[PDB]
Design an enzyme around this catalytic site. Structure first.
Site, mmCIF file in Angstrom:
data_model
loop_
_atom_site.group_PDB
_atom_site.id
_atom_site.type_symbol
_atom_site.label_atom_id
_atom_site.label_comp_id
_atom_site.label_asym_id
_atom_site.label_seq_id
_atom_site.Cartn_x
_atom_site.Cartn_y
_atom_site.Cartn_z
ATOM 1 N N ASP A 230 0.984 -1.195 -0.105
ATOM 2 C CA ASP A 230 0.086 -0.203 -0.017
ATOM 3 C C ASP A 230 0.878 1.223 0.069
ATOM 4 O O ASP A 230 1.708 1.426 0.969
ATOM 5 C CB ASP A 230 -0.847 -0.057 1.047
ATOM 6 N N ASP B 125 -7.578 -2.981 4.232
ATOM 7 C CA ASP B 125 -8.042 -2.315 2.891
ATOM 8 C C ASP B 125 -9.146 -3.083 2.333
ATOM 9 O O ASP B 125 -9.974 -2.395 1.968
ATOM 10 C CB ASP B 125 -6.826 -2.259 1.916
ATOM 11 N N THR C 131 -4.613 4.615 -3.593
ATOM 12 C CA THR C 131 -3.543 5.632 -2.886
ATOM 13 C C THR C 131 -2.212 5.695 -3.717
ATOM 14 O O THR C 131 -2.014 6.812 -4.129
ATOM 15 C CB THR C 131 -3.240 5.394 -1.469
ATOM 16 N N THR C 132 -2.005 4.494 -4.198
ATOM 17 C CA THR C 132 -0.868 4.438 -5.229
ATOM 18 C C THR C 132 -1.114 5.058 -6.417
ATOM 19 O O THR C 132 -0.566 6.135 -6.863
ATOM 20 C CB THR C 132 -0.393 2.855 -5.328
#
Lengths: 522, 532, 527
Positions: free
Chosen positions: A60, A390, A93-94
């Site tokens: 993440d 997540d 988020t990446t």
């Protein structure tokens, strides 16, 4: 000997204008490259070790950026966006960071031209609003449709979101566990209920989902091994009050003339504890848990009378338990009644990897479960936990919002086509900015294919050509190494993730580009 | 696994090279175009040097990173070949490298990009030769003035551009030279440039002849000669040595006096042989002794010492005198001939800025041209002489190649769209490199506008629109045009405006830029070595 | 433009290795660990000796301990250390080779990366291969579920797992020790056993063969008063936690004696209470007592006066072991003590085990005891600790067998057959995962090679012969003649191993190395 008077402190750094802005853009790109490889079904994770020597691997991106303590100011905004998306929707988020950096990257050549940033940010805002509206239009529900089980969308959502992190080849398994688990969370919907238990050792294929509560904890007192450790159909008593001889109760001096009265005093103290224990037994329960420490003597009595007990249990797990067996935590032993007594289908405590755990499960009406997470790596514990977190939070969002979109970047390609076509309508400086918007936006498939080691130009070109006319949800397929209708391939991500991603990236570009100079103070 | 240094590979080193190239670009990005603003360098110790000519900046700027050194050397070569475009060529190279990397930064295989670039350069030069403008029909002095004053802006002297162009064209036409028997080659650097702080360039004067940065050797010796008797002499003037090892040994003392006597009488008779010819002016790179000076005063001739060799060679070429390393003949006897003499109407030493410099006016054998600069400080004077040297260079290019290019960036204005159209022909991946070549090459108008501080995107778009219109309705005699300006911040016709540049500038510029891009792009790893 | 800028603080010293270079570095490190570990595998294997930070020494073969005591700095070394710890405290030995599997696998993985295969597909293929391996393995499993009361299939299993530790001197005896202990303390109705019920105890001195299980509990204290009789035949036992002192309620308390008669009454009470507690313990019918805490000397005597030997300052866990062994309870007062709660045993006898040092206490309880202890003796402190660890691993493996009653003959035949099955599937593999299959098979092939290498034989002649035999015949019962006996039938050789052992080993190693491939980029801060 006079001297000129300074304006600000000695060494107050200042840097104004186009060089400042382009430096910020380059810094954002640098941050991107630290995460560029990460996302992808064949994507990537990083290992970062702190100055303290504690290792930490992560896939993440937000976690990684948290570990990469950024000093440069502009990049701190990007890392904050990482925190925002992490708290909101999960992986991507990446993708969020990549979108932000690529927006800035495409804009920067025009920034070389002396364009007032506000025109750029206005174009950005307009484009983002239009993009969000387009996504919401092409959003897909299922409860209108016929061939959806109320969970199948959730199962496939977990399927999609998972298959980038460290457990990718066990997705068909973990999706079922997480969907069935979150189905129990109703209706509080908050993550604190279901704990995560990082048991050491074991293959993660053996990781356990229990329809109940377990403890990685206990503590050895005298008899704790003596009492029977099976209770087939037990009653759970939940004490917050400690059980010990005025150990940490009210502080009092006592005065006694008659020796016999002193005898009576010590007897009366022990009668306090015996009274509490009698209340406990006559309650009819057999299992007692306590936040506070347990007297050894009370343990002895439970052992003699075949009650199980335990002390010092962490409060969070106690709340889990009480919510599970339906009982209410008690602090007054006297007011006890059967109503507040939790019940469980069966109670146990069984070894897993040398550790002493406690089990009670099978409660038909239990809105909270827990993950026993086997795994041979301590680092797997944190990484799998992050991936699972997540998964849980994204599936929660999915339950909240019955909206799904295709994965594999197909959304981004559709937005690219739509925005590019729209750009033709608006003449002038806005047109170029919209074009750059689309050209930055297309990045997601490119990074996917690069981490897949393909000629993403052939993939991109075929993508655009096929995606002008032939169907909305065509996008990158990793294994077939070319386009596919990923929607039918069940690459399904909640719309909210991409929507929030685009909004955050847009305002990130606004913020960064809305800066001309920087002031530093020692 | 190499000691004394690490290594970097792939993306890191690629980005590093682009980063350095962009740095070097931004070093000079503000000194190009008729609104270019010049640079200046506090050296380390106060001897500053104002200059806008890029190659000078790069040479005087220390550089350590390799690719930046490559660009610096490219700029130096360009200066050795054109004179300006160091205003431009560095920018072109950096921008092409930037966009080529941006392609590569994705994945694109470098050699494909290189092939695309090669094709781009060849297509571009061919299209330029289809875009050429010939000056032969045009009035000579007219276009010469145009090219000059076009180069003169972006410099200190652009304001006086009209006067300066007049002077430059006069000088260059006066330095005509018959070459290999079929070429009228014009030698640059043949015209002499002297700096003299004081009056303004307004009063800076052209010399119909040659000028010396020397002085009269003997104050008693005269100052002005209206006669043309000019003899050159490399051969120095001292009471001669024995010059190799010749020891003089005396066994009969009666002769030491006569020995010493001829030790000077040899020079005396040499001088008398020179003067009996009637030469009244002598020059000598070698030393001049007081012995000769007094003899000259008694003869009243003209003597100059320690003159630079190039200057006296130019003197011989102008006056028609013969360089003479010594006195000799097909027969052993040392004689001198009047045929060796060169001529010029009048030779004067004159005081400019309380420093006497020597002038030579109107050599009859071959007309010479020299230029004197007048200015406030030495900084402005030497930067303007650099400017003038560039001026003479570009005018030489114009004369040598009877061919001109419309200035103000019409070049890449056309080139971008023409290459854009040609790109689709290839059908491979390399047309992507072609398109990026065009878009990057579009940098010149961008820099022009930003240094002129107006909306650059709008000017560039209008330019592209005009050229694209010039690529529709092939009846372009009334639809082909060319032009771009800055002072009014809107397009024009530079052909009408007189904004012209020599073709070789852009041609060699693009070629060298392509080579630089090929060299630097092929990089994928540096390996460092800490020194011994 | 061109100028340095700060992105991450300590920017000079934040080093970074990325991509294929990083991967190759990681594989080098893992291979270094594998080479360090290789020699510790197999009965012919050789163990390591560690030096503690504080200058202490330790000789051992257990790979978990090997890596635990190691002071590694490169991260993936730490990951392997944690690997071995997890595998051990899940199973036991096998850590004798788990990291070996890891290292060989990663080596061959690097072999593949050299051909430019992307790591992710490698990971996926390795996962598929692991699944195939385990399913073939448990097809070819033997079982001890159908066994009669499991006396010496368990004995054979212990015999095997102890072929690796130096305690092998009389390892027969220790095998019976382990099996008897676990069988006594096993909860067959549950399929588990808590090792807290097992009291590991090694006291240096004597021979190694002297080591003996005691169906009872051994306590590191002598008698409270030295004059008390050393032996007791009856074992009426009392277990107390209240110290033999005048009771003090631990709330902040103290009396306020005022008068002559007040003090006299207190003085009388002082001895009256001791007499009371003595009468209580005597009337209880007990014979021997044990107290958690210290004594007042006065009660020490008075206790001596009534032929009631006792022990002072007994730590908790030991106490409850006493309780469960004797079937007694833990009583908090004298008053609530009654005969029913009294503990009983066969024989209690102090032992002056040391020739010149203080003594020990043993309880030879004779009825059934859900607890038991092992007493280890020998000539070296280091050998004592090694015996402790070895016997602990033996107990672990028998426990695991209790968890699952199906095993596989050891000696390497198992994974040999696994590799052959993998190769057979590799033909129906299709594309690139095929290289992954054959890759994993060849990497797994290492354990027989290491065994033979430590055997001093030519490894590969032996392993090729093994493959040929196990192909021509169908018996997956042919490993490597580690102890040089002309039969490769380890089933006859009885070299056996739990299915759970190898299964967990290979699956865990697969996941570990899968992650090892999963990483590309590292950012180490300079120390």
């Amino acid at each position: 000997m006079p001297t000129p008077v300074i304006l600000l402190k000695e060494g107050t750094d200042s840097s104004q204008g186009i060089p400042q802005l382009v430096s910020n853009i380059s810094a954002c790109q640098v941050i991107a490259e630290a995460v560029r490889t990460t996302l992808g079904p064949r994507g990537m994770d990083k290992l970062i070790v702190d100055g303290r020597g504690k290792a930490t691997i992560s896939n993440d991106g937000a976690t990684i950026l948290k570990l990469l303590d950024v000093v440069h100011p502009a990049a701190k905004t990007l890392v904050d966006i990482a925190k925002s998306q992490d708290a909101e929707v999960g992986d991507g988020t990446t993708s969020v960071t990549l979108l932000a950096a690529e927006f800035l990257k495409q804009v920067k050549p025009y920034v070389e031209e002396g364009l007032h940033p506000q025109i750029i940010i206005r174009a950005f805002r307009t484009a983002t609003q239009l993009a969000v509206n387009k996504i919401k239009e092409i959003a897909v529900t299922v409860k209108k449709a016929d061939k959806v089980e109320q969970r199948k969308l959730l199962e496939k959502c977990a399927m999609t979101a998972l298959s980038s992190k460290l457990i990718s080849q066990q997705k068909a398994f973990f999706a079922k566990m997480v969907v069935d688990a979150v189905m129990m969370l109703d209706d509080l919907l908050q993550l604190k209920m279901i704990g995560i238990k990082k048991v050491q050792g074991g293959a993660l294929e053996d990781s356990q989902l229990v329809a109940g509560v377990a403890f990685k904890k206990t503590f050895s007192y005298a008899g704790f091994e003596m009492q029977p450790k099976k209770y087939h159909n037990p009653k759970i008593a939940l004490l917050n009050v400690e059980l010990e001889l005025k150990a940490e109760k009210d502080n009092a001096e006592i005065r006694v003339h008659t020796v016999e009265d002193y005898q009576a005093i010590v007897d009366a103290e022990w009668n306090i504890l015996y009274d509490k224990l009698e209340k406990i037994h006559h309650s009819g329960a057999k299992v007692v848990l306590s936040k506070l420490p347990i007297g050894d003597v009370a343990t002895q009595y439970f052992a003699d009378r075949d009650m199980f007990c335990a002390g010092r249990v962490p409060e969070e797990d106690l709340k889990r338990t009480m919510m599970a067996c339906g009982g209410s935590i008690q602090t007054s032993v006297n007011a006890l009644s059967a109503d507040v007594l939790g019940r469980c289908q069966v109670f146990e405590e069984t070894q897993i990897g040398g550790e002493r755990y406690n089990f009670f499960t099978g409660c038909p009406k239990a809105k909270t479960c827990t993950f026993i997470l086997r795994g041979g790596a301590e680092q797997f514990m944190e990484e799998t936990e992050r991936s699972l977190h997540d998964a849980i939070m994204i599936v929660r969002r999915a339950i909240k919002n019955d909206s799904v979109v295709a994965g594999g970047g197909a959304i981004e390609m559709e937005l690219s086509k739509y925005l590019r076509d729209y750009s033709r309508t608006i003449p002038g400086k806005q047109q170029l900015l919209i074009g750059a918007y689309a050209k930055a936006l297309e990045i997601i498939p490119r990074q996917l294919c690069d981490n897949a080691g393909f000629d993403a130009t052939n993939i991109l070109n075929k993508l655009r050509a096929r995606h002008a006319q032939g169907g909305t949800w065509y996008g990158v397929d990793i294994n077939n190494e070319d386009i596919a209708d990923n929607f039918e391939a069940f690459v399904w991500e909640p719309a909210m993730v991409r929507i929030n991603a685009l909004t955050a990236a847009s305002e990130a570009a606004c913020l960064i580009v809305s800066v001309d100079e920087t002031i530093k103070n020692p | 696994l190499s000691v004394f240094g690490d290594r970097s590979t792939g993306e890191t080193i690629r980005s590093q090279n682009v980063m350095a190239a962009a740095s070097i670009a931004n070093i000079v990005k503000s000194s190009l175009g008729p609104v270019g603003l010049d640079k200046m360098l506090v050296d380390d110790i106060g001897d500053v040097t104002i200059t806008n000519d890029g190659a000078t900046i790069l040479k005087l700027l220390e550089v350590e990173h390799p690719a930046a050194k490559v660009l610096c050397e490219l700029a130096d070569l360009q200066d050795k070949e054109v004179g300006d475009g160091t205003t431009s060529v560095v920018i072109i190279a950096a921008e092409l490298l930037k966009n080529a990397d941006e392609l590569v930064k994705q994945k694109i295989h470098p050699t494909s990009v290189i092939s695309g670039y090669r094709l781009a350069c060849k297509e571009a030069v061919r299209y330029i030769n289809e875009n050429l403008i010939v000056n032969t029909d045009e009035l000579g002095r007219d276009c010469l003035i145009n090219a000059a004053k076009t180069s003169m802006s972006s410099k200190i002297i652009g304001i006086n551009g009209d006067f300066f162009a007049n002077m430059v064209v006069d000088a260059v036409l006066a330095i005509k030279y018959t070459d290999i028997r079929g070429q009228p080659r014009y030698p640059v650097n043949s015209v002499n440039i002297l700096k003299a702080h004081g009056r303004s360039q307004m009063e800076s004067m052209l010399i119909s002849g040659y000028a010396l940065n020397c002085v009269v050797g003997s104050q008693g010796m005269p100052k002005r000669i209206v006669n043309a008797k000019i003899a050159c002499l490399d051969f120095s003037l001292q009471k001669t040595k024995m010059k190799l090892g010749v020891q003089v040994v005396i066994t009969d003392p009666e002769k030491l006096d006569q020995i010493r006597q001829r030790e000077s009488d040899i020079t005396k008779e040499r001088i008398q042989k020179i003067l009996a010819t009637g030469a009244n002016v002598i020059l000598t790179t070698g030393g001049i002794d007081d012995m000769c000076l007094k003899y000259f005063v008694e003869a009243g001739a003209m003597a100059v010492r320690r003159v630079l060799k190039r200057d006296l060679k130019r003197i011989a070429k102008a006056s028609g005198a013969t360089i003479l390393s010594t006195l000799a003949n097909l027969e052993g006897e040392e004689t001198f001939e009047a045929a060796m003499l060169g001529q010029a109407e009048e030779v004067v030493q004159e005081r400019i800025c309380d420093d006497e410099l020597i002038l030579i006016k109107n050599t009859k054998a071959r007309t010479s041209a020299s230029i004197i600069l007048r200015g406030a400080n030495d900084f402005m004077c030497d930067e303007m002489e650099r400017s003038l040297h560039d001026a003479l260079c570009v005018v030489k290019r114009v004369l040598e190649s009877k061919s001109v290019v419309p200035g103000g960036g019409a070049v890449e204005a056309a080139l971008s769209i023409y290459l854009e159209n040609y790109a689709t022909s290839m059908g491979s991946r390399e047309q992507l490199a072609i398109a990026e070549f065009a878009r990057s090459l579009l940098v010149i108008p961008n820099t022009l506008a930003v240094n002129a501080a107006q909306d650059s995107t709008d000017l560039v778009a209008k330019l592209r629109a005009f050229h694209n219109e010039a690529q529709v309705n092939p009846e372009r005699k009334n639809l082909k045009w060319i032009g771009l300006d800055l002072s009014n911040g809107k397009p024009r016709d530079n052909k009408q405006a007189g904004v012209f540049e020599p073709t070789i500038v852009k041609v060699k510029s693009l070629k060298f830029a392509t080579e630089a891009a090929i060299t630097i792009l092929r990089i994928d790893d540096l390996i460092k070595l800490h020194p011994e | 433009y061109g100028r340095p800028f700060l992105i991450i603080k300590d920017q000079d010293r934040k080093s970074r290795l990325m991509g294929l270079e990083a991967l190759k570095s990681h594989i080098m490190a893992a291979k270094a660990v594998a080479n360090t570990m290789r020699t510790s595998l197999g009965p012919n294997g050789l163990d390591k000796m560690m030096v503690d930070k504080d200058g202490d020494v330790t000789v051992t073969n257990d790979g978990a301990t090997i890596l635990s005591m190691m002071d590694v700095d490169h991260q993936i070394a730490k990951l392997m250390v944690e690997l071995s710890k997890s595998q051990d405290d899940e199973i036991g030995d096998g850590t004798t080779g788990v990291v070996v599997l890891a290292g060989a696998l990663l080596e061959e993985a690097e072999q593949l990366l050299d051909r430019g295969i992307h790591p992710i597909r490698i990971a996926d293929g390795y996962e598929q291969a692991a699944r195939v391996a385990i399913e073939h393995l448990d097809k070819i499993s033997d079982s001890v579920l159908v066994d009669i009361k499991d006396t010496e299939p368990l004995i054979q299993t212990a015999k095997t797992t102890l072929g690796s530790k130096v305690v092998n001197s009389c390892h027969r005896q220790m095998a019976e020790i382990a099996v008897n202990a676990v069988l006594t303390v096993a909860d067959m109705e549950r399929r588990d056993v808590d090792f807290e019920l097992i009291k590991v105890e090694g006291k240096v001195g004597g021979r190694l063969e002297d080591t003996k299980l005691i169906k009872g509990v051994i306590v590191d204290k002598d008698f409270s008063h030295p004059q008390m009789p050393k032996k007791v035949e009856d074992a009426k036992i009392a277990i107390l936690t209240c110290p033999f002192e005048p009771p003090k309620p631990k709330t902040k308390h103290k009396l306020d004696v005022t008068s002559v008669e007040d003090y006299k009454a207190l003085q009388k009470y002082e001895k009256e209470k001791f007499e009371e507690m003595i009468q209580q313990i005597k009337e209880t019918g007990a014979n021997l007592a044990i107290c958690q805490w210290g004594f007042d000397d006065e009660a020490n005597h008075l206790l001596l006066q009534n032929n009631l030997p006792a022990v002072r300052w007994v730590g908790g866990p030991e106490i409850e072991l006493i309780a469960i062994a004797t079937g007694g309870r833990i009583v908090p007062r004298f008053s609530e003590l009654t005969a029913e709660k009294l503990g009983f045993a066969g024989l209690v006898q102090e032992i002056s085990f040391g020739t010149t040092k203080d003594k020990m206490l043993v309880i030879e309880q004779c009825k059934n005891s859900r607890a038991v202890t092992i007493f280890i003796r020998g000539g070296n402190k280091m050998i004592i600790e090694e015996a402790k660890r070895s016997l602990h691993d033996a107990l672990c493996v028998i426990r695991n067998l209790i968890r699952d009653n199906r095993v596989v003959y050891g000696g390497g035949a198992a994974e040999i057959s696994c590799a052959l099955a993998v190769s057979q599937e590799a033909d129906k593999c299709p594309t690139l995962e095929q290289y992954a299959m054959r890759a994993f098979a060849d990497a797994l092939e290492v354990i027989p090679m290491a065994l033979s290498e430590n055997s001093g034989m030519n490894p590969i002649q032996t392993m090729t012969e093994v493959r040929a035999r196990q192909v021509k015949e169908m018996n997956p019962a042919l490993g490597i003649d580690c102890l040089h006996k002309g039969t490769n039938d380890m089933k006859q050789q009885h070299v056996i191993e739990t299915l759970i052992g190898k299964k967990q080993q290979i699956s865990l190693a697969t996941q570990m190395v899968r992650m090892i491939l999963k990483i590309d980029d590292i950012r180490k801060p300079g120390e």
